[PDB]
Amino acid sequence: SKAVTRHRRVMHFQRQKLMAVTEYIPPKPAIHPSCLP
Amino acid sequence: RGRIPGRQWIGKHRRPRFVSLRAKQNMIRRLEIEAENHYWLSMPYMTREQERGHAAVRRREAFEAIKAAATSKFPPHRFIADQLDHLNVTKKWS
Amino acid sequence: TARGTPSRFLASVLHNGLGRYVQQLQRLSFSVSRDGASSRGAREFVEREVIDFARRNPGVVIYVNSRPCCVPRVVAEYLNGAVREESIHCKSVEEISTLVQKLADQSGLDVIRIRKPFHTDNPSIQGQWHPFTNKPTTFRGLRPREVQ
Amino acid sequence: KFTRSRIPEKVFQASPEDHEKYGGDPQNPHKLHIVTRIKSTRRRPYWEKDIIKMLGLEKAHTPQVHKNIPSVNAKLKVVKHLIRIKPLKLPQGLPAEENMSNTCLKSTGELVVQWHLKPV
Amino acid sequence: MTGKELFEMWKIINPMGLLVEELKKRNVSAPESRLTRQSGGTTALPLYFVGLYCDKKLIAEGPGETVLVAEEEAARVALRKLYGFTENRRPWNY
Amino acid sequence: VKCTKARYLKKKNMRTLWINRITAASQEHGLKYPALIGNLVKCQVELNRKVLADLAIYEPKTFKSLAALASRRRHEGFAAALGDGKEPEGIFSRVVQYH
Amino acid sequence: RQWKVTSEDLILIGNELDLACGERIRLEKVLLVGADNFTLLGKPLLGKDLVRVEATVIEKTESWPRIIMRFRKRKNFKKKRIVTTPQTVLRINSIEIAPCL
Amino acid sequence: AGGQWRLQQGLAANPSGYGPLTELPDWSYADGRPAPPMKGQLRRKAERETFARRVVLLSQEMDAGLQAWQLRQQKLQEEQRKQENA
Amino acid sequence: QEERERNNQNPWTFERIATANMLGIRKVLSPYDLTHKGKYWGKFYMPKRV
Amino acid sequence: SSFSRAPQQWATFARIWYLLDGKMQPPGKLAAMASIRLQGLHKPVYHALSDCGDHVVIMNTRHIAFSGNKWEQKVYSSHTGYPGGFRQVTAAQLHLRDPVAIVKLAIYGMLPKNLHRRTMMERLHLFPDEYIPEDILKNLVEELPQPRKIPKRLDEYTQEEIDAFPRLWTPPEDYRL
RNA sequence: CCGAGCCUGGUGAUAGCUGGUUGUCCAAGAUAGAAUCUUAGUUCAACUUUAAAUUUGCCCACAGAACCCAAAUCCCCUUGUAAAUUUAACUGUUAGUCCAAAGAGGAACAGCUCUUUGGACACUAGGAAAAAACCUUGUAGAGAGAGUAAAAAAUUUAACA
Ligand SMILES: [Mg+2]
Ligand SMILES: [Mg+2]
Ligand SMILES: [Mg+2]
Ligand SMILES: [Mg+2]
Ligand SMILES: [Mg+2]
Ligand SMILES: [Mg+2]
Ligand SMILES: [Mg+2]
Ligand SMILES: [Mg+2]
Ligand SMILES: [Mg+2]
Ligand SMILES: [Mg+2]
Ligand SMILES: [Mg+2]
Ligand SMILES: [Mg+2]
Ligand SMILES: [Mg+2]
Ligand SMILES: [Mg+2]
Ligand SMILES: [Zn+2]
């Protein structure tokens, strides 16, 4: 198939592993900023 | 019920594979040792011009050894001993 | 093949290692021909090495027939009565020597599949495991859910 | 399409945090790379596989030595994803001719010239 | 002699009586037999562990199909222990 | 061909059988196989799985000793996780260095 | 490979040791040793002076003929070979422990 | 199992790799005589000594190349001296 | 988007991995990915992706 | 040891009668441990050819408890053999009609799919209530513990525990409650 | 059993087409294209093979390679390695499938078709459920030794002054 598709083109497994490793991990303190501060 | 069109792993529709923390740990390990490799590849010891002409003698002499091994090739030597040892098949006690 | 072949448990005859060791090979009988290029190796072997072989191994006995034979043979009898017949037809002297030496070192019992590569006379120390070794007892020996 | 991948030179620029982490002095840098092949040669381009055969890494988990110089670091960069790399560092000076036989490696990249094979 | 145990060669009858005789020779009380463990009493495969206790002191335990068999076995164990032919004994020195 | 390719299967089957036996013995002592193996290794004892199973069968007391050692090493490792350094190392966690 | 052994017990190995029959040898490596009420295991192996394991050689023999046959499908690939691996049989005569500890 | 721990300690990941469990002799004469080395130990010693020879060669080649560069640069300096003297 | 890609705790980003070619993934990837690092996949657009 | 060969062999390969009370436990966990004991894995002499299994008894299977809405949503399906004979029933009504089927088939699924499965299932025993025939509650060995603990209710929590537990917040007095 | 009889002989008719092709063991070894009343084949080339002569072969470091209107590539001393060219003799392959990427046709359909770089398969083994093409992994044996490789998806959803 083509690169550009109407549907979401299923990706290679290594590609999906990489995208599953790469995410935005939100930096939060150990304490929630509402109850304590 | 629950079948897949065509082959299970190819085409416009295939079986959806999913990732596991097992594989995630595996690949993070591989890429972190690869970052170690990057670090150790950095900070070279010598410069291009410093390491330019040090191994020329070794490369040359190795190649002439290869050349000599190639040139020195002939049929083996033939011997009367090897020829006549075949007569000892008709050995027998007197 | 294992299922096609019979099997046995590893064992030594008369526990040869504990007391004095004795070579379990008893007798050898060589069948060679004066003529015949096939027996040239055997003739040269009885010339050179069989003397030294006998000197090295006094307990064994050796017989040589030296008769007309198209194929030279070697027969080995053991204390068990086990017989081993090998054809040395057109065979070299050093390999005949290796054959004879491994025959002498060989034990008088058929070479077949060994079920397990060891054998213990009394494998149990500290007591064999039974289901009740690793669980406690009950006061007055009472089963679960019984009054008296 | 798929072709040989060029690497930007900035990737190989250690940072102070990298130095503090890996314990590698940018000054007086090590001389020799211990190298091992960790990844399979298959499912890789012909150039990568013949380059590891060039280095002599057809055998896996077999530590082999090279120099830390640009002409070699280029090939090591080409096949960096397939290999473990570490430096060579020894306390006991270069192996002397008398101690050629009783040498030994260590998992830490160390090369001991004496190997008494007994505990302290 | 190595392999085979005692009662394979030297069979006996009335091991309990023989044991009581030996204990009266060694000047100790008459021990009592008590099933220490039980399983499948009603089952076709009864299983008993019977111990022999003197003066509230155990000498031997014996497993068995039935109570009588387990008692005979415990007596055999105690006899082996007394006569020194335990399987865990010092081997023969050559 | 099946006789050839049954060899590796024999190896794997017997390994898994030793695994199962050791797991059972450890479970009836209150431990489990991964903990046991890791603790023994970091206590510097190389007893392969077959001798482990043979010892579990024929010598349960020695296996109880080994399981106790393993559990004590688990507890020492937990104490170390609580305090990484700044503490006296475990008596059994101590190691021997060769040269 | 490991073994669990005692006195008066046989053992097989699948290689040649370069020993004549009747020879006695002292086995060095021991992972542990156990008596009825105690056992002794090293880190990893025990000291030389502590134990003395002695074994006699009894037999040198080729193993039974084992097949190695390779075969592939619908492409005329089949390949046979026979092997007779050598074997040596040992017997542990006795085991002793020293007071040094 | 425990390979990462063995590496943390400095040991081989697989105990069969190196150490006393494998490098010591597996048998000796009952009379106390030393047994001949095993073939595995022989070939491992051979590999190790070739490894050391190669390391020495590589190191001293690098050193000689560096010294040659130093000498060539010093020559460069003195020949500039010669030029301006001319 | 920019403060998220600045403050993310994951040390590993498609930018770094692709520009490095640390796992030979340059074959499964495209040359377009070097600029379409993670955000794009064909015509689609993953704004949460970073 | 110092035991005779036949008594030792009998004692070693003997069977054991385990008992379990399934009151307020999950049938999955119960079936896990029961399948272990039936296969005989817990015995360090395990081997599939050697029928080293053990007999197991369950009580109070009527008082079994799942986690989640499984009673309502999980479905057991079976086909009689006739056309249209395919029918389904939730665990709830299947329990109402037969209280033991659930755990017995759970163990049937846990166990391997060999021919020994049926024999081990026959060695197995199940009882909806804590009532047992004389033979079967006599020929026992040991009652192994339960996997999970049961949380206590307010009528079970003694007063001293409540007093030790601190109150948390001040309610305003003006409140209907 | 006549779109033109049956018997014999030429006749072992010819068949680019189908089928079949007998003992054991080892090694190297799937490869761009051109012309053809030619595309079910064949000749040359390319690849592969054997024996010999010789020496450079491969990776490649700066520099270098267009106006018009991106990944990379050619050349390339060093370096790390040991192959390469040439000579003499043939044979066989020359109807190819998926995946990743750049594209074209088609519907931004196809397990679709057509070109290019790479990989795998048509060679063994483990895994994704069984699976050709996906992921780990190659040089071959005996073992009742051991350390690892890739390797098991998580998700539940909407009140309002
Ligand atoms: Mg495409
Ligand atoms: Mg299908
Ligand atoms: Mg007609
Ligand atoms: Mg006609
Ligand atoms: Mg024809
Ligand atoms: Mg055909
Ligand atoms: Mg080949
Ligand atoms: Mg044609
Ligand atoms: Mg060049
Ligand atoms: Mg076609
Ligand atoms: Mg197609
Ligand atoms: Mg297609
Ligand atoms: Mg083909
Ligand atoms: Mg190999
Ligand atoms: Zn709060």
Phi, psi of D42 (to 5 degrees): -70, 165
What does the DSSP 8-state code read for residue B75? P
- Host H or E run for residue F49: helix F49-58
Cβ neighbours, 10 Å, residue J170 = 6
CA separation (Å) from G41 to B46, F91, G31, J108, J146? 51, 16, 6, 44, 37
- C63 Cβ partners below 8 Å, 6+ apart? C27, C28, C29, C30
**What DSSP line would sit under chain J, residue for residue?**
----HHHHHHHHS---EEEEE-TT--HHHHHHHHHHHHHTTTSTT--TTS----EEEEE-GGG---SSSHHHH-EEEEE-SSTT-EEEEEHHHHHHH-SSHHHHHHHHHHS-SSTHHHHHHHH-EE-SSS---HHHHHS--EEPPPSSPPPPPTTTS-HHHHHHSPP--PPPSS---
Report if CB I1 to strand K is under 7 Å.
Answer: no
**CA distance, residue J30 to nearest chain F CA (Å):** 16
First to last CA, chain E: 14
- Answer whether B91 touches C (CB < 8 Å): yes
One-letter amino acid at F26 equals: S
Structure tokens at B88: 């000892």
Task: Report the distance separating Cα I28 and Cα H61, nearest Å.
Answer: 42
- Torsion sign over Cα J86, J90, J93, J97: positive
Task: Report the distance separating Cα I35 and Cα F89, nearest Å.
Answer: 52
Query: What beta strand segments (E) does chain G contain?
Result: 9-13, 24-27, 32-34, 39-41, 51-62, 66-72, 77-83, 86-97
Q: Give the method used.
A: cryo-EM
Report if CB B74 to strand K is under 7 Å.
Answer: yes
Q: Which residues sit opposite D83 in a β-bridge?
A: D37
**Cβ–Cβ under 8 Å, residues G25 and G97:** no
First to last CA, chain I: 8
Task: Report the distance separating Cα D45 and Cα I6, nearest Å.
Answer: 35
D5: Cα within 13 Å, side-chain hemisphere: 26
First to last CA, chain J: 73
Structure tokens at A28: 């939060």
Interface of F with D in 69-98 (CB under 8 A): 96-98
Strand-pair category, J55-59 with J17-21: parallel
Task: Report the distance separating Cα A27 and Cα H24, nearest Å.
Answer: 54
Q: Is C31 helix (H, G, I), strand (E, B) or coil?
A: strand
Cβ neighbours, 10 Å, residue I25 = 21
Strand-pair category, C113-114 with C7-8: parallel
Phi, psi of E54 (to 5 degrees): -105, 140
Domain limits for position H6: 2-86
Give the count of domains, chain F: 1
Q: Which CATH class is domain C1-148?
A: alpha beta
- F11 Cβ partners below 8 Å, 6+ apart? none
- Host H or E run for residue F7: helix F2-29
Q: Is B91 helix (H, G, I), strand (E, B) or coil?
A: coil
Alpha helix stretches (DSSP H) within chain B: 21-41, 56-71, 80-84
Nearest residue to K131, CA vs C1'?
B8
**Cβ–Cβ under 8 Å, residues D54 and D76:** no
Structure tokens at E10: 């030297």
The CATH code of the domain that includes J46 is 3.90.1180.10
**Cβ–Cβ under 8 Å, residues F32 and F62:** no
CA of J176 to C1' of K161 (A): 22
- 10 Å CB burial of residue C105 (0-12, 13-18, 19+) is buried
**Cβ–Cβ under 8 Å, residues I19 and D8:** yes
Length of chain A equals 37
Buried b (16+ CB within 10 A) or exposed e, C20-36: ebebbbbebbbbbbeeb
Task: Report the distance separating Cα G80 and Cα G60, nearest Å.
Answer: 26
Nearest to J15 by CA among E41, E50, F31: E41
- I16 Cβ partners below 8 Å, 6+ apart? none
Give the count of domains, chain D: 1
The CA-based angle J102-J106-J107, given to 5 degrees, is: 125
Buried b (16+ CB within 10 A) or exposed e, G19-35: bebebebbbbbbbbbbe
- J161 Cβ partners below 8 Å, 6+ apart? none
Structure-token match 């009420």, residue found:
G37
Phi, psi of H30 (to 5 degrees): -60, -25
Q: Is A13 helix (H, G, I), strand (E, B) or coil?
A: helix
**F88 upstream amide cis, omega within 30 of 0:** no
Task: Report the distance separating Cα J152 and Cα J158, nearest Å.
Answer: 10
**Cβ–Cβ under 8 Å, residues I5 and A10:** no
The CA-based angle H24-H27-H32, given to 5 degrees, is: 100
Task: Report the distance separating Cα D38 and Cα D23, nearest Å.
Answer: 23
Phi, psi of H71 (to 5 degrees): -65, -40
Structure tokens at J2: 């110092």
Task: Report the distance separating Cα J158 and Cα J154, nearest Å.
Answer: 8
Task: Report the distance separating Cα G78 and Cα G67, nearest Å.
Answer: 13
- D57 Cβ partners below 8 Å, 6+ apart? D35, D36, D37, D64, D83
Structure tokens at A8: 């979401």
Nearest to J53 by CA among J105, J14, J104: J14
One-letter amino acid at E37 equals: R
Round the CA-based radius of gyration of chain E to a whole number and report it. Answer: 14
Task: Report the distance separating Cα G65 and Cα G81, nearest Å.
Answer: 10
**Cβ–Cβ under 8 Å, residues E79 and E22:** yes
Nearest to C67 by CA among C108, C36, C107, C112: C36
Give the count of domains, chain J: 1
Task: Report the distance separating Cα H1 and Cα G85, nearest Å.
Answer: 31
**Cβ–Cβ under 8 Å, residues J96 and J164:** no
Domain limits for position D46: 1-117
Phi, psi of E62 (to 5 degrees): -135, 130
Query: What beta strand segments (E) does chain C contain?
Result: 7-8, 25-31, 61-64, 73-78, 83-87, 113-114, 118-120
Task: Report the distance separating Cα G54 and Cα G49, nearest Å.
Answer: 13
Phi, psi of J117 (to 5 degrees): -60, -45
Closest chain C residue by Cα to residue J20: C144
- 10 Å CB burial of residue F17 (0-12, 13-18, 19+) is middle
Task: Report the distance separating Cα J45 and Cα F17, nearest Å.
Answer: 10
Structure tokens at F81: 């996780």
Q: H62 vs B58: CB contact, 8 Å cut-off?
A: no
Q: Tell me, in Å, the resolution of the deposited structure.
A: 3.8
Task: Report the distance separating Cα E29 and Cα E20, nearest Å.
Answer: 9
**Cβ–Cβ under 8 Å, residues G70 and F1:** yes
Structure tokens at C74: 């070697």
- H5 Cβ partners below 8 Å, 6+ apart? F38, F41, F42
Strand-pair category, J125-126 with J55-59: parallel
Long-range contacts of residues C66-71, Cβ cutoff 8 Å, at least 24 apart: C66/C32, C66/C33, C66/C34, C67/C31, C67/C32, C67/C33, C68/C33, C68/C34, C68/C35, C69/C31, C69/C32, C69/C33, C69/C36, C69/C39, C70/C33, C70/C36, C70/C38, C71/C38
- Answer whether F91 touches G (CB < 8 Å): no
- Chain centroid to CA J133: 19
Cβ neighbours, 10 Å, residue E90 = 8
Chains in contact with A via at least 3 Cβ–Cβ pairs below 8 Å: B, I
The CA-based angle G85-G89-G91, given to 5 degrees, is: 165
- Answer whether G25 touches H (CB < 8 Å): yes
Q: H11 vs D104: CB contact, 8 Å cut-off?
A: no
Residues of G in contact with E87 (CB under 8 A): none
Chains in contact with E via at least 3 Cβ–Cβ pairs below 8 Å: C, G, J
Structure tokens at G29: 């490596």
Structure tokens at B46: 């010598």
- B21 Cβ partners below 8 Å, 6+ apart? none
Domain limits for position F66: 1-99
Structure tokens at B65: 């050894």
Strand-pair category, J142-143 with J125-126: unpaired
Q: Dihedral (C-alpha) C44, C48, C49, C50: value to the nearest 10 degrees?
A: 80
Buried b (16+ CB within 10 A) or exposed e, C40-55: bbbbebbeebbeebee
Domain limits for position J174: 1-177
Residues of J in contact with C135 (CB under 8 A): 142
Strand-pair category, C61-64 with C25-31: parallel
The angle, 0 to 180 degrees and rounded to 10, between the axes of the packed helices J27-39 and J101-110 is: 50
Query: Across chain E, which distance is largest between two alpha carbons, in Å?
Result: 51
- Chain centroid to CA F43: 9
Task: Report the distance separating Cα C88 and Cα C73, nearest Å.
Answer: 6
Cβ neighbours, 10 Å, residue B46 = 20
Structure-token match 């499965």, residue found:
J117
**Cβ–Cβ under 8 Å, residues G56 and C21:** yes
Task: Report the distance separating Cα F32 and Cα J9, nearest Å.
Answer: 27
Strand K, nucleotides < 7 Å from a protein CB: these are: 24-26, 52-61, 70-73, 77-84, 98-103, 106, 108-112, 116-125, 128, 130-131, 133-139, 141-153
Task: Report the distance separating Cα C138 and Cα I34, nearest Å.
Answer: 73
J33: Cα within 13 Å, side-chain hemisphere: 21
Task: Report the distance separating Cα C114 and Cα G64, nearest Å.
Answer: 9
Phi, psi of C25 (to 5 degrees): -85, 130
Q: Indicate the residue of D29, D76, D80 with minimum beta-carbon distance to B43.
A: D29
Task: Report the distance separating Cα J167 and Cα J177, nearest Å.
Answer: 17
Structure tokens at C53: 């072989």
Give the count of domains, chain H: 1
Residues of F in contact with G32 (CB under 8 A): 45, 47, 62
Buried b (16+ CB within 10 A) or exposed e, J125-137: bbbbeeebeeebb
Task: Report the distance separating Cα D115 and Cα D113, nearest Å.
Answer: 7
- Torsion sign over Cα H59, H62, H68, H72: negative
Structure-token match 């799942």, residue found:
J66
Lateral strand order in the sheet of D32-37: D64-67, D32-37, D83-87
- Host H or E run for residue F56: helix F49-58
Choose, out of G8, G91, G95, the residue to mutate when testing the contact with E (most E CBs < 10 Å): G8
**Cβ–Cβ under 8 Å, residues C63 and C75:** no
Q: Is C114 helix (H, G, I), strand (E, B) or coil?
A: strand
**CA distance, residue E89 to nearest chain G CA (Å):** 9
Structure tokens at B19: 């990732």
Cβ neighbours, 10 Å, residue H58 = 17
**Cβ–Cβ under 8 Å, residues D76 and B41:** yes
Chains in contact with C via at least 3 Cβ–Cβ pairs below 8 Å: B, E, F, G, J
Nearest to J141 by CA among F63, E36, E52, F64: E36
**Cβ–Cβ under 8 Å, residues B46 and H68:** no
Report the 3 state secondary structure along chain D: CCCCCCCCHHHHCCCHHHHHHHCCCCCCCCCEEEEEECCCCCCCCHHHHHHHHHHCCCCCCCCEEEECCHHHHHHHHHCHHHEEEEECCCCCCCCCHHHCCCCEECCCCCEECCCCCCEC
Q: E91 vs G94: CB contact, 8 Å cut-off?
A: yes
Nearest to G57 by CA among G22, G14, G26, G28: G22
Q: D95 vs H56: CB contact, 8 Å cut-off?
A: yes
**Cβ–Cβ under 8 Å, residues F49 and F15:** yes
**What DSSP line would sit under H18-76, residue for residue?**
SSHHHHS-S-EETTSPPPPPPHHHHHHHHHHHHHHHHHHHHHHHHHHHHHHHHHHHHHH
- Host H or E run for residue F61: helix F60-82
Q: H21 vs F42: CB contact, 8 Å cut-off?
A: no
CA separation (Å) from G19 to C129, G25, G28, G61, G87? 38, 9, 17, 13, 12
